Structure 1
Protein backbone atom coordinates (compact mmCIF):
# COMPACT_ATOMS: atom_id res chain seq x y z
CA UNK A 1 0.00 0.00 0.00
CA UNK A 2 1.89 3.05 -1.30
CA UNK A 3 -1.00 5.55 -1.21
CA UNK A 4 -0.60 8.58 1.04
CA UNK A 5 2.20 10.61 2.61
CA UNK A 6 4.64 8.65 4.74
CA UNK A 7 4.13 5.00 5.59
CA UNK A 8 5.60 2.78 8.26
CA UNK A 9 7.46 -0.17 6.80
CA UNK A 10 7.14 -3.71 8.18
CA UNK A 11 8.58 -7.06 7.03
CA UNK A 12 4.93 -7.69 6.14
CA UNK A 13 4.46 -11.13 7.65
CA UNK A 14 0.96 -12.32 6.91
CA UNK A 15 -0.57 -10.58 9.86
CA UNK A 16 -2.96 -9.15 7.30
CA UNK A 17 -6.62 -10.07 7.74
CA UNK A 18 -9.67 -8.71 5.96
CA UNK A 19 -13.03 -8.01 7.59
CA UNK A 20 -15.22 -11.08 7.14
CA UNK A 21 -13.38 -11.97 3.93
CA UNK A 22 -14.51 -9.27 1.51
CA UNK A 23 -12.74 -5.97 0.80
CA UNK A 24 -14.17 -2.51 1.55
CA UNK A 25 -16.02 -1.38 -1.56
CA UNK A 26 -17.42 1.90 -2.80
CA UNK A 27 -21.13 2.56 -2.94
CA UNK A 28 -22.82 0.98 -5.92
CA UNK A 29 -24.95 3.90 -7.01
CA UNK A 30 -25.68 4.08 -10.71
CA UNK A 31 -29.33 3.75 -9.79
CA UNK A 32 -31.38 6.17 -7.66
CA UNK A 33 -30.14 6.38 -4.05
CA UNK A 34 -29.01 9.99 -4.56
CA UNK A 35 -29.19 12.17 -7.69
CA UNK A 36 -26.45 14.40 -6.27
CA UNK A 37 -23.05 12.77 -6.79
CA UNK A 38 -20.67 12.45 -3.86
CA UNK A 39 -17.14 12.53 -5.29
CA UNK A 40 -14.06 11.15 -3.57
CA UNK A 41 -10.38 10.72 -4.53
CA UNK A 42 -8.24 8.07 -2.85
CA UNK A 43 -5.58 10.33 -1.32
CA UNK A 44 -7.24 13.62 -0.27
CA UNK A 45 -8.25 12.43 3.20
CA UNK A 46 -6.77 8.94 3.19
CA UNK A 47 -3.69 10.31 4.93
CA UNK A 48 -2.16 8.01 7.53
CA UNK A 49 -3.66 9.63 10.61
CA UNK A 50 -1.68 8.23 13.52
CA UNK A 51 -3.32 8.71 16.90
CA UNK A 52 -1.60 9.28 20.23
CA UNK A 53 0.41 6.28 21.44
CA UNK A 54 -0.68 4.75 24.72
CA UNK A 55 0.96 3.07 27.69
CA UNK A 56 0.58 -0.52 28.89
CA UNK A 57 1.14 -1.19 32.58
CA UNK A 58 0.70 -4.51 34.38
CA UNK A 59 -2.53 -3.15 35.80
CA UNK A 60 -3.80 -2.05 32.41
CA UNK A 61 -7.06 -3.79 31.53
CA UNK A 62 -7.72 -2.98 27.89
CA UNK A 63 -8.99 -0.06 25.86
CA UNK A 64 -11.66 0.76 23.27
CA UNK A 65 -12.44 3.33 20.57
CA UNK A 66 -15.38 4.32 18.34
CA UNK A 67 -14.48 5.07 14.72
CA UNK A 68 -16.92 7.32 12.89
CA UNK A 69 -16.57 9.40 16.02
CA UNK A 70 -12.80 9.35 16.63
CA UNK A 71 -12.46 11.73 13.70
CA UNK A 72 -14.36 14.90 14.67
CA UNK A 73 -11.89 17.61 15.56
CA UNK A 74 -9.40 14.97 14.40
CA UNK A 75 -7.75 15.60 11.03
CA UNK A 76 -9.25 17.04 7.83
CA UNK A 77 -11.47 13.95 7.98
CA UNK A 78 -13.34 15.44 10.93
CA UNK A 79 -13.42 18.97 9.52
CA UNK A 80 -15.55 17.84 6.55
CA UNK A 81 -17.63 14.90 7.78
CA UNK A 82 -19.16 17.05 10.50
CA UNK A 83 -20.40 19.36 7.77
CA UNK A 84 -21.33 16.61 5.33
CA UNK A 85 -24.81 15.14 5.58
CA UNK A 86 -23.91 11.46 5.07
CA UNK A 87 -20.92 9.12 5.48
CA UNK A 88 -19.65 5.66 4.46
CA UNK A 89 -16.13 4.18 4.43
CA UNK A 90 -13.81 1.25 4.99
CA UNK A 91 -10.69 1.28 7.16
CA UNK A 92 -7.14 0.00 7.33
CA UNK A 93 -6.16 0.28 10.95
CA UNK A 94 -2.74 -0.51 12.31
CA UNK A 95 -2.24 -1.22 15.98
CA UNK A 96 1.51 -1.35 16.44
CA UNK A 97 3.40 -1.96 19.66
CA UNK A 98 7.08 -1.30 20.26
CA UNK A 99 8.69 -3.55 22.84
CA UNK A 100 11.91 -5.20 23.94
CA UNK A 101 12.92 -8.83 23.46
CA UNK A 102 12.89 -9.17 27.26
CA UNK A 103 9.22 -8.33 27.63
CA UNK A 104 6.38 -10.85 27.61
CA UNK A 105 2.67 -10.28 27.07
CA UNK A 106 -0.35 -10.79 24.88
CA UNK A 107 -2.60 -8.27 23.15
CA UNK A 108 -5.81 -9.07 21.32
CA UNK A 109 -6.78 -6.57 18.65
CA UNK A 110 -10.40 -7.23 17.80
CA UNK A 111 -13.03 -5.40 15.82
CA UNK A 112 -16.70 -4.96 16.77
CA UNK A 113 -19.47 -3.26 14.72
CA UNK A 114 -22.26 -2.06 16.96
CA UNK A 115 -20.56 -1.38 20.27
CA UNK A 116 -23.05 -0.58 23.01
CA UNK A 117 -20.71 -0.28 25.96
CA UNK A 118 -23.21 -0.24 28.80
CA UNK A 119 -23.03 0.82 31.40
CA UNK A 120 -24.05 0.64 35.07
CA UNK A 121 -23.21 2.61 38.22
CA UNK A 122 -23.50 1.46 41.81
CA UNK A 123 -26.99 0.06 42.29
CA UNK A 124 -30.27 1.40 43.63
CA UNK A 125 -28.74 3.20 46.59
CA UNK A 126 -29.47 6.67 45.24
CA UNK A 127 -30.21 6.29 41.51
CA UNK A 128 -30.56 3.35 39.08
CA UNK A 129 -28.90 4.57 35.87
CA UNK A 130 -26.95 7.57 34.54
CA UNK A 131 -24.85 6.36 31.61
CA UNK A 132 -22.16 8.92 30.76
CA UNK A 133 -22.56 11.75 28.24
CA UNK A 134 -18.87 11.52 27.37
CA UNK A 135 -19.43 7.86 26.48
CA UNK A 136 -19.05 8.84 22.82
CA UNK A 137 -16.04 10.82 21.65
CA UNK A 138 -13.47 8.73 23.41
CA UNK A 139 -10.26 10.54 22.48
CA UNK A 140 -7.26 8.75 20.99
CA UNK A 141 -5.97 8.40 24.55
CA UNK A 142 -9.28 7.26 25.97
CA UNK A 143 -10.70 5.30 27.42
CA UNK A 144 -9.93 2.60 30.00
CA UNK A 145 -12.47 -0.15 30.63
CA UNK A 146 -14.15 -1.05 33.91
CA UNK A 147 -14.86 -4.73 33.47
CA UNK A 148 -12.82 -6.05 30.49
CA UNK A 149 -14.04 -9.61 30.96
CA UNK A 150 -17.48 -8.48 29.82
CA UNK A 151 -16.37 -5.37 27.85
CA UNK A 152 -18.64 -3.29 30.08
CA UNK A 153 -21.38 -4.73 27.86
CA UNK A 154 -22.17 -8.06 29.50
CA UNK A 155 -20.35 -9.81 26.67
CA UNK A 156 -17.28 -12.06 27.09
CA UNK A 157 -13.88 -11.53 25.46
CA UNK A 158 -13.77 -15.33 25.76
CA UNK A 159 -15.64 -15.26 22.45
CA UNK A 160 -14.46 -11.84 21.25
CA UNK A 161 -12.53 -13.64 18.52
CA UNK A 162 -15.88 -14.43 16.86
CA UNK A 163 -15.53 -10.95 15.41
CA UNK A 164 -12.65 -10.04 13.07
CA UNK A 165 -9.66 -10.07 15.39
CA UNK A 166 -5.88 -10.21 15.36
CA UNK A 167 -3.20 -11.24 17.83
CA UNK A 168 -0.12 -9.42 19.04
CA UNK A 169 2.18 -11.84 20.80
CA UNK A 170 5.49 -10.29 21.86
CA UNK A 171 6.89 -13.77 21.31
CA UNK A 172 6.16 -13.34 17.62
CA UNK A 173 4.29 -10.33 16.24
CA UNK A 174 4.62 -6.76 17.49
CA UNK A 175 2.53 -5.51 14.57
CA UNK A 176 -1.00 -6.28 13.40
CA UNK A 177 -3.09 -4.96 10.52
CA UNK A 178 -6.83 -5.47 10.07
CA UNK A 179 -9.21 -4.07 7.45
CA UNK A 180 -12.93 -3.42 7.93
CA UNK A 181 -15.55 -2.44 5.32
CA UNK A 182 -18.65 -0.38 6.00
CA UNK A 183 -21.20 -2.18 8.15
CA UNK A 184 -24.74 -0.89 8.54
CA UNK A 185 -28.39 -1.63 7.70
CA UNK A 186 -28.60 1.54 5.62
CA UNK A 187 -25.95 2.29 2.99
CA UNK A 188 -25.92 5.83 4.38
CA UNK A 189 -26.47 6.92 7.97
CA UNK A 190 -25.04 10.01 9.64
CA UNK A 191 -21.62 9.89 11.29
CA UNK A 192 -21.08 11.58 14.65
CA UNK A 193 -24.54 10.65 15.93
CA UNK A 194 -24.14 6.94 15.24
CA UNK A 195 -20.79 5.22 15.69
CA UNK A 196 -21.07 2.31 13.26
CA UNK A 197 -18.07 0.64 14.73
CA UNK A 198 -15.79 -0.02 17.71
CA UNK A 199 -12.15 -1.11 18.09
CA UNK A 200 -10.72 -3.02 21.05
CA UNK A 201 -7.12 -3.61 22.12
CA UNK A 202 -7.20 -5.76 25.26
CA UNK A 203 -4.32 -7.64 26.93
CA UNK A 204 -4.97 -11.23 28.05
CA UNK A 205 -1.56 -12.14 29.45
CA UNK A 206 -1.08 -8.97 31.53
CA UNK A 207 2.64 -8.34 30.79
CA UNK A 208 5.69 -8.76 33.03
CA UNK A 209 9.14 -7.17 33.23
CA UNK A 210 11.88 -7.80 35.79
CA UNK A 211 12.47 -4.17 36.84
CA UNK A 212 15.39 -1.99 35.76
CA UNK A 213 13.71 -2.24 32.39
CA UNK A 214 11.29 0.33 30.97
CA UNK A 215 7.94 -0.72 32.55
CA UNK A 216 5.79 1.04 29.94
CA UNK A 217 4.75 -0.52 26.64
CA UNK A 218 3.66 1.73 23.73
CA UNK A 219 0.61 0.62 21.78
CA UNK A 220 0.62 2.89 18.73
CA UNK A 221 -2.54 2.90 16.62
CA UNK A 222 -2.22 3.92 12.96
CA UNK A 223 -5.28 4.54 10.79
CA UNK A 224 -6.01 4.73 7.06
CA UNK A 225 -9.68 5.05 6.01
CA UNK A 226 -10.34 3.61 2.54
CA UNK A 227 -13.36 3.98 0.24
CA UNK A 228 -14.80 7.03 2.01
CA UNK A 229 -17.85 8.91 0.77
CA UNK A 230 -18.10 12.71 0.66
CA UNK A 231 -18.35 15.79 -1.58
CA UNK A 232 -18.70 19.07 0.34
CA UNK A 233 -21.07 21.64 1.87
CA UNK A 234 -20.95 25.03 3.68
CA UNK A 235 -19.40 26.81 6.68
Structure 2
Protein backbone atom coordinates (compact mmCIF):
# COMPACT_ATOMS: atom_id res chain seq x y z
CA UNK A 1 0.00 0.00 0.00
CA UNK A 2 3.06 2.23 -0.28
CA UNK A 3 5.64 1.15 -2.87
CA UNK A 4 2.98 0.83 -5.58
CA UNK A 5 1.57 4.07 -6.93
CA UNK A 6 -0.50 5.32 -9.83
CA UNK A 7 -0.77 8.94 -10.89
CA UNK A 8 -3.53 10.01 -13.27
CA UNK A 9 -3.56 13.55 -14.68
CA UNK A 10 -5.56 14.46 -17.77
CA UNK A 11 -5.48 11.80 -20.47
CA UNK A 12 -2.11 10.61 -19.14
CA UNK A 13 -1.26 8.30 -16.25
CA UNK A 14 1.86 6.90 -14.57
CA UNK A 15 2.34 3.62 -12.73
CA UNK A 16 5.31 2.67 -10.60
CA UNK A 17 5.86 -0.55 -8.66
CA UNK A 18 8.88 0.75 -6.78
CA UNK A 19 8.53 4.17 -5.14
CA UNK A 20 9.41 6.03 -1.98
CA UNK A 21 6.33 7.95 -0.82
CA UNK A 22 5.73 11.32 -2.57
CA UNK A 23 7.08 14.76 -1.65
CA UNK A 24 4.74 17.71 -1.42
CA UNK A 25 6.98 20.76 -1.55
CA UNK A 26 6.69 23.00 1.51
CA UNK A 27 3.55 21.21 2.63
CA UNK A 28 1.18 22.79 0.09
CA UNK A 29 -0.82 21.74 -2.94
CA UNK A 30 -0.98 23.75 -6.16
CA UNK A 31 -4.02 25.99 -6.36
CA UNK A 32 -5.71 28.71 -8.36
CA UNK A 33 -5.00 32.31 -7.45
CA UNK A 34 -7.35 33.69 -4.77
CA UNK A 35 -9.32 36.85 -5.47
CA UNK A 36 -7.58 38.65 -2.60
CA UNK A 37 -4.03 38.03 -3.83
CA UNK A 38 -4.79 38.71 -7.49
CA UNK A 39 -4.07 42.05 -9.13
CA UNK A 40 -4.67 41.94 -12.91
CA UNK A 41 -8.34 42.66 -13.64
CA UNK A 42 -8.90 40.60 -16.80
CA UNK A 43 -10.22 37.07 -16.60
CA UNK A 44 -7.67 34.23 -16.70
CA UNK A 45 -8.12 31.15 -18.85
CA UNK A 46 -8.19 27.67 -17.33
CA UNK A 47 -7.88 24.89 -19.91
CA UNK A 48 -7.60 22.13 -17.29
CA UNK A 49 -7.26 18.75 -19.02
CA UNK A 50 -5.62 20.03 -22.19
CA UNK A 51 -2.69 21.67 -20.39
CA UNK A 52 -2.57 19.77 -17.09
CA UNK A 53 -1.18 16.34 -17.99
CA UNK A 54 2.10 14.43 -18.14
CA UNK A 55 4.61 15.52 -20.77
CA UNK A 56 7.68 13.31 -21.22
CA UNK A 57 11.05 14.70 -22.26
CA UNK A 58 13.82 12.72 -23.94
CA UNK A 59 15.93 10.45 -21.78
CA UNK A 60 19.38 11.37 -20.50
CA UNK A 61 21.72 8.38 -20.62
CA UNK A 62 23.68 7.49 -17.56
CA UNK A 63 27.42 6.96 -17.48
CA UNK A 64 30.32 6.71 -15.03
CA UNK A 65 31.66 10.19 -15.76
CA UNK A 66 28.24 11.88 -15.77
CA UNK A 67 28.16 15.05 -13.69
CA UNK A 68 24.37 15.54 -13.69
CA UNK A 69 21.76 17.59 -15.53
CA UNK A 70 19.25 20.34 -14.94
CA UNK A 71 16.12 21.78 -16.55
CA UNK A 72 14.06 24.95 -16.06
CA UNK A 73 10.32 25.18 -15.55
CA UNK A 74 8.00 26.20 -17.36
CA UNK A 75 10.76 26.71 -19.96
CA UNK A 76 11.02 23.02 -20.91
CA UNK A 77 7.32 23.07 -21.76
CA UNK A 78 7.10 26.36 -23.65
CA UNK A 79 7.43 24.71 -27.08
CA UNK A 80 5.37 21.58 -26.41
CA UNK A 81 1.69 20.72 -26.54
CA UNK A 82 -1.15 23.10 -25.80
CA UNK A 83 0.81 24.27 -22.74
CA UNK A 84 3.48 25.74 -24.98
CA UNK A 85 0.92 27.57 -27.08
CA UNK A 86 -0.98 29.19 -24.22
CA UNK A 87 2.26 30.42 -22.68
CA UNK A 88 3.14 32.17 -25.96
CA UNK A 89 -0.17 33.99 -26.40
CA UNK A 90 -0.45 35.15 -22.80
CA UNK A 91 1.68 37.54 -20.81
CA UNK A 92 0.78 36.12 -17.40
CA UNK A 93 1.35 32.54 -16.30
CA UNK A 94 0.75 30.70 -13.03
CA UNK A 95 0.70 27.03 -12.00
CA UNK A 96 2.37 24.22 -10.13
CA UNK A 97 3.95 21.00 -11.34
CA UNK A 98 4.19 17.29 -10.61
CA UNK A 99 7.68 15.96 -11.35
CA UNK A 100 8.46 12.30 -11.96
CA UNK A 101 11.87 10.78 -12.72
CA UNK A 102 12.35 7.25 -14.02
CA UNK A 103 15.65 5.44 -13.69
CA UNK A 104 15.78 1.65 -13.32
CA UNK A 105 18.51 -0.97 -13.27
CA UNK A 106 19.03 -4.49 -11.97
CA UNK A 107 19.87 -5.90 -8.56
CA UNK A 108 23.53 -6.10 -9.59
CA UNK A 109 23.73 -2.33 -10.23
CA UNK A 110 24.34 0.46 -7.76
CA UNK A 111 24.38 4.22 -7.42
CA UNK A 112 22.28 7.08 -6.15
CA UNK A 113 20.76 10.19 -7.70
CA UNK A 114 19.90 13.41 -5.91
CA UNK A 115 16.66 14.86 -7.27
CA UNK A 116 15.88 18.36 -6.01
CA UNK A 117 13.61 21.30 -6.79
CA UNK A 118 15.31 24.66 -6.58
CA UNK A 119 13.18 27.83 -6.50
CA UNK A 120 14.88 30.71 -8.33
CA UNK A 121 17.81 28.63 -9.53
CA UNK A 122 20.51 30.96 -10.79
CA UNK A 123 23.43 29.66 -12.79
CA UNK A 124 26.71 31.49 -12.41
CA UNK A 125 29.62 32.60 -14.52
CA UNK A 126 32.82 30.65 -14.06
CA UNK A 127 35.96 32.76 -13.94
CA UNK A 128 38.30 34.75 -11.73
CA UNK A 129 37.25 38.11 -13.15
CA UNK A 130 36.16 40.58 -10.47
CA UNK A 131 35.28 43.38 -12.88
CA UNK A 132 31.61 43.29 -13.97
CA UNK A 133 32.78 44.33 -17.43
CA UNK A 134 35.39 41.64 -18.10
CA UNK A 135 33.56 39.11 -15.91
CA UNK A 136 32.00 36.15 -17.76
CA UNK A 137 28.30 35.32 -17.88
CA UNK A 138 26.45 32.21 -19.09
CA UNK A 139 24.63 32.13 -22.39
CA UNK A 140 20.88 32.04 -22.90
CA UNK A 141 21.08 28.43 -24.08
CA UNK A 142 22.74 27.66 -20.73
CA UNK A 143 20.51 29.73 -18.41
CA UNK A 144 17.40 28.31 -20.15
CA UNK A 145 18.40 24.92 -21.56
CA UNK A 146 15.03 23.93 -22.99
CA UNK A 147 13.92 20.34 -23.51
CA UNK A 148 17.48 19.22 -24.18
CA UNK A 149 18.58 19.96 -20.61
CA UNK A 150 22.00 21.19 -19.57
CA UNK A 151 24.92 19.70 -17.65
CA UNK A 152 26.98 20.72 -14.66
CA UNK A 153 30.54 21.85 -15.08
CA UNK A 154 30.98 21.77 -11.29
CA UNK A 155 28.29 19.57 -9.75
CA UNK A 156 29.83 19.91 -6.28
CA UNK A 157 29.06 23.63 -5.96
CA UNK A 158 25.90 23.27 -8.10
CA UNK A 159 27.25 25.76 -10.65
CA UNK A 160 25.76 28.49 -8.46
CA UNK A 161 28.64 28.64 -5.98
CA UNK A 162 26.74 26.77 -3.26
CA UNK A 163 27.54 23.36 -1.72
CA UNK A 164 25.58 20.36 -2.95
CA UNK A 165 25.49 18.85 0.52
CA UNK A 166 23.00 21.51 1.68
CA UNK A 167 20.69 20.95 -1.29
CA UNK A 168 18.60 18.81 1.04
CA UNK A 169 16.85 21.97 2.18
CA UNK A 170 14.89 21.99 -1.08
CA UNK A 171 12.13 19.47 -1.63
CA UNK A 172 14.04 16.43 -2.77
CA UNK A 173 14.22 12.62 -3.00
CA UNK A 174 16.86 10.07 -3.92
CA UNK A 175 16.85 7.35 -6.49
CA UNK A 176 18.82 4.59 -4.79
CA UNK A 177 18.97 1.75 -7.26
CA UNK A 178 18.54 -0.84 -4.53
CA UNK A 179 15.42 0.86 -3.16
CA UNK A 180 13.31 2.87 -5.61
CA UNK A 181 13.26 3.41 -9.37
CA UNK A 182 11.37 6.73 -9.31
CA UNK A 183 11.28 10.07 -7.51
CA UNK A 184 8.13 12.22 -7.46
CA UNK A 185 7.76 15.77 -6.10
CA UNK A 186 4.63 17.93 -6.31
CA UNK A 187 5.62 21.59 -6.50
CA UNK A 188 3.21 24.44 -5.69
CA UNK A 189 3.38 27.73 -7.51
CA UNK A 190 6.17 29.67 -5.80
CA UNK A 191 7.01 33.25 -6.71
CA UNK A 192 7.01 36.71 -5.19
CA UNK A 193 4.20 37.79 -7.56
CA UNK A 194 0.95 35.93 -8.30
CA UNK A 195 1.43 35.78 -12.10
CA UNK A 196 4.53 36.11 -14.24
CA UNK A 197 5.82 35.66 -17.78
CA UNK A 198 6.57 32.05 -18.65
CA UNK A 199 9.01 33.21 -21.32
CA UNK A 200 11.21 35.69 -19.43
CA UNK A 201 11.25 33.97 -16.04
CA UNK A 202 11.64 30.36 -14.93
CA UNK A 203 10.28 29.60 -11.48
CA UNK A 204 12.50 26.66 -10.57
CA UNK A 205 14.96 24.18 -12.00
CA UNK A 206 15.12 20.41 -11.60
CA UNK A 207 18.38 18.68 -10.72
CA UNK A 208 19.51 15.07 -11.09
CA UNK A 209 23.00 14.38 -9.78
CA UNK A 210 25.11 11.26 -9.12
CA UNK A 211 26.19 11.59 -5.52
CA UNK A 212 27.26 7.95 -5.69
CA UNK A 213 28.40 6.86 -9.17
CA UNK A 214 26.86 4.12 -11.29
CA UNK A 215 28.64 0.77 -11.01
CA UNK A 216 27.93 -2.57 -12.62
CA UNK A 217 30.12 -5.61 -13.08
CA UNK A 218 30.94 -6.54 -16.68
CA UNK A 219 28.28 -8.42 -18.61
CA UNK A 220 25.35 -6.45 -17.24
CA UNK A 221 23.51 -3.68 -19.04
CA UNK A 222 25.66 -0.63 -19.79
CA UNK A 223 22.82 1.57 -21.02
CA UNK A 224 20.82 3.26 -18.24
CA UNK A 225 18.67 6.27 -19.22
CA UNK A 226 17.07 8.94 -17.02
CA UNK A 227 13.60 9.94 -18.20
CA UNK A 228 11.62 12.93 -16.97
CA UNK A 229 7.84 13.37 -16.94
CA UNK A 230 6.27 16.58 -15.64
CA UNK A 231 2.68 17.76 -15.36
CA UNK A 232 1.42 21.34 -14.85
CA UNK A 233 -1.11 21.13 -12.00
CA UNK A 234 -3.59 24.02 -11.79
CA UNK A 235 -2.66 26.31 -14.69
CA UNK A 236 -3.85 29.86 -15.39
CA UNK A 237 -3.05 32.31 -18.17
CA UNK A 238 -3.77 36.00 -18.59
CA UNK A 239 -2.95 39.00 -20.72
CA UNK A 240 -3.84 37.55 -24.10
CA UNK A 241 -2.00 38.96 -27.11
CA UNK A 242 -0.07 37.80 -30.18
CA UNK A 243 2.51 34.99 -30.02
CA UNK A 244 6.00 35.55 -28.61
CA UNK A 245 8.42 32.65 -28.37
CA UNK A 246 11.02 34.84 -26.64
Query: Which runs of 5 or more structure 2 residues have no equivalent in the other structure?
Result: 1-6
Which of 21, 24, 27 is 2:27 aligned to? 21
Give 1 or 2: higher strand fraction.
2
Which of 86, 92, 96 is 1:86 aligned to? 92
- Which residue in 2 is equivalent to 1:170? 177
Mapped partners of 1:167, 1:120: distance in 2: 28
- What TM-score do the two structures reach when normalised by structure 1? 0.91
Mapped partners of 1:31, 1:149: distance in 2: 38
- Which residue in 2 is equivalent to 1:191? 198
- Which residue in 2 is equivalent to 1:138? 145
Mapped partners of 1:95, 1:193: distance in 2: 26
- Which residue in 2 is equivalent to 1:70? 76
Which of 105, 118, 130 is 2:124 aligned to? 118
Could you list the per-position Cα deviations for residues 147-183 of structure 1 after superposition, in whole angstroms to 9, with x for gaps in the alignment?
0000111111101001110111001001111010111
- What TM-score do the two structures reach when normalised by structure 2? 0.87
- Indicate the SS of the match to 1:9: strand
Mapped partners of 2:103, 2:193: distance in 1: 35
Question: How much does 1:198 deviate?
Answer: 0.8
Question: How much does 1:12 deviate?
Answer: 6.8
- Which residue in 1 is equivalent to 2:232? 225
- More displaced, 60-69 or 39-48? 39-48
Say whether 1:209 aligns with 2:216.
Answer: yes
Say whether 1:149 aligns with 2:149.
Answer: no
- Which residue in 2 is equivalent to 1:33? 39
Mapped partners of 2:18, 2:113: distance in 1: 19
